Each structure stands twice: as structure tokens, then as C-alpha cells.
Amino acid sequence: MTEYKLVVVGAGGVGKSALTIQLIQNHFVDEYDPSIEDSYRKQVVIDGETCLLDILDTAGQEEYSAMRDQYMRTGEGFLCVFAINNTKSFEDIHQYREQIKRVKDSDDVPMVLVGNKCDLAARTVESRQAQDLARSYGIPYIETSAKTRQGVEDAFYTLVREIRQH
Ligand SMILES: Nc1nc2c(ncn2[C@@H]2O[C@H](COP(=O)(O)OP(=O)(O)NP(=O)(O)O)[C@@H](O)[C@H]2O)c(=O)[nH]1
Numbered sequence: 193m194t195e196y197k198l199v200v201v202g203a204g205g206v207g208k209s210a211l212t213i214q215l216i217q218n219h220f221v222d223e224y225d226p227s228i229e230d231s232y233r234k235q236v237v238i239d240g241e242t243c244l245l246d247i248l249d250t251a252g253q254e255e256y257s258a259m260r261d262q263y264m265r266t267g268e269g270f271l272c273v274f275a276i277n278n279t280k281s282f283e284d285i286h287q288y289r290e291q292i293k294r295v296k297d298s299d300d301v302p303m304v305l306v307g308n309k310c311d312l313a314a315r316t317v318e319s320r321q322a323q324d325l326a327r328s329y330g331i332p333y334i335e336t337s338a339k340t341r342q343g344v345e346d347a348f349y350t351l352v353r354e355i356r357q358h
């Protein structure tokens with residue numbers, strides 16, 4: 193078994209914590225702790241390869257960049273969570289990547305861009321725009337929904353692929 197430190201990122205309400213709680217507890221946060229260091233780790237099998245998945249759930253921009261260096265430096269990969277309905281996410285998701293290149297000290301970093309909230313009926317950022325970043329960054333683009341729970345794990349699994357490749 194291998195330990196995969198999955199460092200999740202988010203502007204706050206993009207669904208970062210929603211994807212984690214789903215991939216771990218599998219449910220919609222109705223009264224869970226408001227952001228904490230109590231990271232989680234689930235055991236799965238990537239293409240017939242049993243390995244551990246330690247998904248770290250950080251805070252949503254609550255003044256703690258100092259710790260961001262401790263996690264990012266210890267994270268095997270990064271997952272960019274953006275809301276198709278919230279254009280704000282697409283904004284922070286851009287600068288967010290720049291933070292990784294700094295810590296990792298290299299443009300080549302294993303990460304994935306997921307589009308949470310793919311169930312809502314009021315999307316602002318079309319797949320085209322979301323693809324621009326994934327195509328410009330050279331990373332995969334997956335769509336999921338914490339509410340309906342569609343291809344949720346599909347987004348996480350993709351991360352393991354990027355890492356393994358590197
Ligand atoms: N409609 C819809 N809402 C979602 C979906 N996923 C998450 N949400 C909701 O959108 C909001 C996102 O913020 P929240 O759940 O508080 O997570 P958070 O903001 O990261 N917590 P915090 O800010 O304390 O770190 C919550 O109400 C969350 O339940 C989704 O797929 N569809």
C-alpha cells in the first residue's frame with residue numbers, strides 16, 4: 193500500500209470540503225466541523241492497485257499561509273475545485289495554481305481541475321473556459337457534484353494518475 197497525500201484547495205464554497213467529506217464519509221455537510229486539520233485518509237484501488245488516499249482538507253482562506261507551506265510541501269498532488277455556477281472560483285483557482293509552482297518550485301506538478309456543482313441549473317463558466325485552464329496547465333478536467341454525487345470519485349482518482357505519471 194502507498195500513501196497519497198491529496199492536498200485539496202478551494203476559495204471557500206467551491207466544494208473543496210464537499211468533495212473530501214464525500215470521498216470519505218460520503219454525505220452532504222449539514223453540521224460538520226467548519227474547516228479543520230482533522231484530515232482524512234481512505235483506502236482504495238487505482239486500476240487494481242490498492243493504495244491509501246490521504247485527502248487533506250485545509251481552511252478556506254482564513255489567514256494561514258504559513259501552514260500552507262507545510263502541507264503543500266508534504267502534498268503529493270493538488271486538486272483545484274471550482275464551481276461552474278460560481279465564476280469567483282474560476283478566479284481563485286487560477287492564482288491557486290501559482291502558489292503550488294512556488295512551493296514545489298517547478299511548473300511540472302501533479303494536479304487536477306474538477307468542476308463541482310455540476311447539478312445546479314445556473315452555470316456561468318462553461319466547460320470551454322474550464323478546459324482553457326486544464327489545457328493551458330496540461331492537467332485533466334473532470335466534472336462532479338457534491339449534491340447529486342456524480343463522478344465524485346472519478347475526480348479524485350484522476351489525481352492518483354497524475355502523480356503516478358510523475
Ligand atoms: N447546490 C449545491 N451546493 C453545494 C454543492 N456542494 C456543496 N454545496 C454547498 O455550498 C456551500 C459550500 O460551502 P460549505 O459547505 O460551507 O463548505 P466550506 O465553505 O468549505 N466550509 P468553510 O467555509 O467553513 O471552510 C455549502 O452549503 C455546501 O453544502 C453542490 O454540489 N451543489
Ligand SMILES: [Mg+2]
Binds near residue numbers: 204
Ligand atoms: Mg471548507
